[PDB]
């Protein structure tokens with residue numbers, strides 16, 4: 001299991017938590033020196049528990065599908081919660097079995113469905129380590145409308161940062177001031193599937209992307225990713241969703 005304590009957290013202990021997280025995710029092979037997530041993992045081994053502790057030391061435990069880095073569900077004290085989706089329901093029969101009651105949330109775990117429940121797109125939702133602390137607190141006591149917004153902040157402060165250095169870095173400067181995510185930070189949230197695909201198709205294409213990926217850069221300028229020699233591939237991206245899943 002991997003852990004992260006928001007009490008006395010610095011951009012350092014956050015980096016370390018994000019490091020742990022990446023290494024919790026199995027892979028036999030690297031593609032252009034980037035871990036290749038497995039096609040599938042049979043049973044409870046499919047899921048990763050994250051123990052998170054808000055500032056006042058209350059905790060929740062977030063289960064993550066390791067083939068794709070998706071949040072499936074989490075546990076608050078003695079109540080488990082899983083999204084409204086078949087993988088989550090699947091995920092539910094391996095983890096938090098000891099929860100007194102299990103609650104299916106009223107949405108599947110994708111940004112579109114999450115953003116509607118919350119009533120705002122994630123471009124207007126501050127994120128950072130405080131907004132993570134909040135999240136943890138919000139989900140401690142059920143409120144589906146609130147828990148939407150708080151899951152958009154948990155997904156991003158965890159899954160996305162682990163996936164991408166840049167975003168991890170965007171979270172470390174938001175160590176003490178939340179802030180809405182940069183336009184690029186979103187681009188990369190939305191392009192993960194694409195990049196995981198193209199980086200893998202470049203294996204027998206001489207490092208060229210069968211289909212270029214359109215991004216936004218740090219500056220707010222739209223740009224195209226045609227090849228593995230782009231900084232995004234060499235520097236940024238830390239994990240690849242197996243094409244056996246796209």
Ligand SMILES: *[C@@H]1O[C@H](CO)[C@@H](O)[C@H](O)[C@H]1NC(C)=O
Nearest residue numbers: 208224225226227228229230
């Ligand atoms: C590769 O990408 C770099 C940086 O984006 C660019 O300068 C170059 O024209 C591209 N080369 C190939 C072979 O795709």
Ligand SMILES: O=c1cc[nH]c(=O)[nH]1
Nearest residue numbers: 070071109110111159
């Ligand atoms: O939509 C997404 C993308 C990544 N991780 C999630 O939990 N949901």
